[PDB]
Design a binder for this molecule. Structure first.
Ligand code: ATP
Ligand code: ATP
Ligand code: ZN
Ligand code: ZN
Lengths: 362, 184, 96, 145, 48
């Protein structure tokens, strides 16, 4: 009983760990099938409802089965991740904290910076009896004990590492105990180390890939209430496919510079909007009705929206979407305004993005 | 300085090597303050010079502004300069840097809440997750599992991970709540 | 061009000593030899510190080596900077 | 086979002008820039298709009143009342437009979803017209280099 | 390509003698040895 259940548990864990990647890739295929079926999803007429158009009539049961399958596969993918990749993360974290304890004295000579979540959360696992559960070195507590025991206090180090004080002495000496059996639930409760599992769960919840898979599960669940949430699962192509990563790295290699270029463009357009609001306002009427104007630069905010949206998306600049300046006192000024906008924003500022992408490629 | 000179000019003398270990603490204390350069001496031979580096000089050298100046100087000499002016440009940069750090020395005379909230959310949510086990009411599920079945085992296997996923969702919601309470 | 210039600066600083100009291949016959040479023997920060020390030290209090370097510096003659030579290359027979 | 078919229809001899790539060797240097990163150019088009599908999903779910493409008040030309039709519209007209999908749909001013539509159009222009079309240029230039 | 060609010309002229073709590493065993060799011993202007 208490052994057969563990054997079957291990069998299931091994199966899911082995097939983590297979189900991970099957989820993408199911998401693509769902989103291809969704391309035949019409709207029919207030309280309006979305209808799945179908000549065969096989479209809707297939969609429901595929959604249920996707949810099941997402759950199986989380289980497989926990079985397969979580132990590596725990091993690496345990190794890091052990080596910071030994060769840096992270909790003896120094302390964490009080704003490092990893450093503050690692305080829990030091006292645990199941420390290096995954890390091979089972003597890290003894090593730190020997290194820092004399100068910093043997009892202080023992309390910090959560080691035994006096039972080991008597057990090397003479003592007697009574046995137990695995069937005792109290024995199982004593065997389970609550604090170490608490720290492990914290580390797993802080893991960035487990969080991503949980988000995948959350949108798979939401897809049952609204079938269009399965479209967010097509963002998984970047992670699932590795050849698309080469293309996407060109954008993300100079990612900070691409954001700063957009910020610089925003500042330049704000300066142009200030100039227009102060000098060129009569040219921003966007209505053909003579009676009622559509003055788009009578407000600072509105003129800035106009310049950032219409002027930036225009292929010739802001001068392609405003009144012609011919026969006006500010004609050469407007011409210079438009030409400089076209050169600096449409031509130069939009060229920096191209250059950044091509430089990332190179 | 005497011991370092003797050791570096007598690199294989065992008596001096065993004598040096008797001065490790002094040599370790004076290590950051011990200057060491190499020059082409008047005897037409490469000679090593030992001098003193002050703590103030080192601290002003390690300032970020001086680091940026050094980086720019190195870039300029590597790209726009030649070997035929390298040591002249280096001496000019050294003079400017020395003046700047002397001036800096004389003019200089003598979130956490979010991290704590996230840690509290982790603690609270994980404790709530572990309270099913800390409740000691496992007798009900034991009586359910008395009629052991593969279906029941698989259901419990899936339910454990479903509970983990719900705990993560609750933790995420608590994180959003803490962030929204802190900003407002 | 800017990327290539930065890469060239990095490559030069990693494969050639700033002062003597000897490549890292010669110094890397002893493990970490180039790092030891460029951070303990021919450190440009150390040369700057030496210039500071020589300037702040009284002229009558210089040793002979310091006076030699001081006279060369006052004449703006940079022959005291090792160029193509070092302690290891000079005493390679005795050192090893 | 095409030379034979050219006798029945004289316009099949136009397919023999595709032989310039094989016959001429200097044209191969130019054509290698396209074909060097050939798989990446196809994957970029696939990524563009996926991104436009996501934009089409957003439009179909939130921005439908803005996709009327008729001047006749009586009869509309609703181009986003169907998932497939809205996807055709976004892939064809929006992609070929020089400013994005916002150059070919109803003006969003004076609407509840005005800032949302502005963000939609600006992000479409930046990601598709500016960035996704820049990857092709970069791939060709990188093949040259 | 033009930038690379100019850089190649500069690198060749700085690291190799025009006449004999011996690299600067051999000549830079005496301080300023390459400059002395290329401006006093193997000067192309001197050959002209
Ligand atoms: N004469 C020299 N003096 C110092 N470094 C040299 C010298 N010759 C070559 N180098 C090399 O050039 C490298 C550049 O060092 P640099 O001062 O730029 O950075 P760093 O010491 O790693 O730190 P940081 O720039 O962050 O202050 C050195 O690490 C060293 O290996
Ligand atoms: N045989 C050689 N004759 C002359 N210079 C040589 C020779 N071999 C290598 N060089 C190097 O090539 C470098 C190029 O010199 P170059 O004539 O281009 O410029 P310059 O003498 O600095 O002045 P400028 O070009 O302004 O008249 C020289 O400075 C020298 O270091
Ligand atoms: Zn050196
Ligand atoms: Zn020569």
């Amino acid at each position: 009983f208490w052994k057969k259940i563990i054997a079957y548990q291990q069998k299931l864990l091994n199966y899911f760990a082995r097939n983590f990647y297979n189900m991970r890739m099957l989820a993408l295929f199911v998401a693509f099938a769902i989103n291809f079926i969704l391309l035949f999803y019409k709207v029919s007429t207030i309280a309006v409802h979305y209808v799945l158009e179908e000549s065969s009539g096989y479209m809707e049961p297939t969609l429901r089965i595929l959604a249920i399958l996707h949810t099941v596969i997402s759950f199986f993918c989380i289980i497989g991740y926990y079985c397969l990749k979580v132990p590596l993360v725990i091993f690496k974290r345990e190794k890091e904290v052990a080596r910071k304890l030994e060769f840096d004295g992270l909790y003896i000579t120094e302390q964490p910076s009080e704003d490092d979540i990893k450093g503050q959360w690692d305080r829990l696992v030091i006292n645990t009896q199941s420390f290096p559960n995954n890390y091979w070195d089972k003597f890290v507590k003894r090593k730190v004990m020997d290194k820092y025991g004399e100068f910093y206090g043997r009892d202080r180090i023992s309390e910090l590492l959560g080691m035994d004080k006096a039972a080991l002495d008597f057990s090397d000496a003479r003592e007697k105990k009574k046995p137990k059996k695995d069937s005792s639930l109290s024995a199982v409760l004593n065997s389970i180390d609550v604090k170490y599992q608490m720290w492990k769960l914290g580390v797993v919840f802080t893991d960035n890939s487990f969080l991503y898979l949980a988000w995948y599960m959350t949108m798979s669940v939401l897809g049952h209430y609204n079938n269009f949430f399965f479209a967010a699962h097509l963002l998984d192509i970047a992670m699932g496919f590795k050849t698309l990563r080469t293309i996407l790295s060109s954008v993300t290699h100079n990612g900070k510079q691409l954001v700063l270029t957009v910020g610089l463009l925003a500042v330049v357009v704000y300066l142009y909007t200030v100039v227009a609001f102060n000098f060129f306002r009569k040219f921003y009427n966007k209505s053909e009705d003579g009676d009622t104007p559509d003055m788009k630069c009578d407000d600072m905010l509105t003129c800035y929206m106009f310049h950032m949206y219409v002027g930036v998306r225009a292929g010739g600049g802001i001068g392609d979407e405003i009144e012609d300046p011919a026969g006006d006192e500010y004609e050469i000024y407007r011409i210079i305004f438009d030409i400089t906008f076209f050169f600096f924003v449409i031509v130069i500022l939009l060229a920096i993005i191209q250059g950044l992408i091509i430089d990332a490629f190179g | 300085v005497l011991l370092t000179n003797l050791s570096e000019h007598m690199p294989n003398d065992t008596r001096l090597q065993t004598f040096l270990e008797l001065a490790e603490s002094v040599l370790n204390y004076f290590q950051p303050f011990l200057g060491r350069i190499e020059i082409m001496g008047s005897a037409k031979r490469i000679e090593r010079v030992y001098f003193e580096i002050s703590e103030s000089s080192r601290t002003q050298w390690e300032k970020p502004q001086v680091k940026e100046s050094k980086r720019q100087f190195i870039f300029d000499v590597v790209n726009e300069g030649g070997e035929k002016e390298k040591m002249e440009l280096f001496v000019n940069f050294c003079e400017d840097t020395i003046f700047e750090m002397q001036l800096a020395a004389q003019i200089s005379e003598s979130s956490i809440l979010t991290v704590r909230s996230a840690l509290f959310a982790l603690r609270y949510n994980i404790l709530t997750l572990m309270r099913m086990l800390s409740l000691k009411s496992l007798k009900k599920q034991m009586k359910k599992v008395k009629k052991m079945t593969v279906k029941d085992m698989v259901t419990a296997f899936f339910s454990s991970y479903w509970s983990i996923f719900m705990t993560l969702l609750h933790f995420v919601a608590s994180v959003f709540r803490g962030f929204f309470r802190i900003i407002c | 061009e800017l990327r290539d210039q930065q890469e060239q600066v990095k490559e030069d600083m990693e494969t050639k000593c700033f002062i003597c100009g000897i490549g890292n291949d010669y110094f890397d016959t002893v493990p970490h030899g180039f790092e030891t040479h460029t951070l303990q023997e021919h450190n440009l920060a150390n040369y700057l510190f030496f210039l500071m020390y020589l300037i702040n030290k009284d002229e009558t209090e210089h040793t002979g080596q310091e006076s030699y370097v001081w006279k060369m510096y006052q004449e703006r003659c940079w022959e005291f900077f090792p160029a193509g030579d070092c302690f290891r290359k000079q005493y390679e027979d005795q050192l090893n």
